[PDB]
Design a protein around this ligand. Structure first.
Ligand SMILES: [K+]
Length: 218
């Protein structure tokens, strides 16, 4: 069998318009809706992502996780000239499709795909990828890494006061430990957004968690 991601790219290349990111997003959602691939229909969560990008105008965004490139296209299309999206993905085959998707959208120059495990790459951002602090982090990778990677970003000095974390799929299948941490911590100011999943007909959600600076040494 062909993978979902390679079939999504096939559909985009044959139906979307090159250099037209909206047409790419719509083609992905159209195809995934037809196939009833609920986790790959991104328009509902995309509305929330777009509003965050529009409000905060981040210059440097870290994306954790990529499958077919939908979220990278969604974010990169709203980033300013000169901005940078760093996208970490452990599966090289997903990284490959994501790269091809960005090329078709004409957005490749704004994005750097890093193929590897987030916990290995995060400690390299400062010295190897010339990062000071991140303006935004989009969490959409392995569920059990949301909390550990947040703690790792903190420890590596990659978050500043005002850094916006936006976490996807916090309800389904869920990231309850991550939610409990950010909601209970004085280092984060949190907002929850409902986001519907078709077929399962359930309200998933995203969490926006804005870093406030580290806890007191007292
Ligand atoms: K809090």
């Amino acid at each position: 069998g062909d993978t979902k991601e390679q079939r999504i790219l096939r559909y985009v290349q044959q139906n979307a318009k090159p250099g037209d990111p909206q047409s790419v997003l719509e083609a992905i959602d159209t195809y995934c809706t037809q196939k009833e691939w609920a986790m790959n229909v991104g328009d509902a969560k995309g509305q929330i992502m777009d509003a965050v990008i529009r409000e905060y105008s981040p210059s440097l965004v870290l994306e954790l996780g990529a499958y077919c490139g939908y979220s990278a296209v969604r974010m990169a299309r709203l980033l300013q000239p000169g901005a940078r999206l760093l996208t970490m993905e452990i599966n090289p085959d997903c990284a490959a499709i994501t790269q091809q998707m960005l090329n078709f959208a004409g957005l490749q120059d704004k994005v750097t795909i890093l193929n590897g495990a987030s916990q290995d790459l995060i400690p390299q951002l400062k010295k190897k990828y010339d990062v000071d602090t991140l303006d935004m982090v989009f969490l959409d990778h392995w569920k059990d890494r949301y909390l550990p990677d947040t703690l790792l970003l903190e420890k590596c000095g990659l978050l500043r006061k005002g850094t916006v974390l936006l976490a996807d799929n916090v309800i389904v299948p869920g990231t309850p430990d991550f939610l409990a941490y950010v909601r209970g911590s004085s280092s984060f100011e949190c907002t929850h957004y409902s986001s519907y999943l078709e077929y399962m007909k359930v309200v998933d959600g995203l969490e926006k968690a804005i870093y406030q600076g580290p806890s007191s040494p007292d």
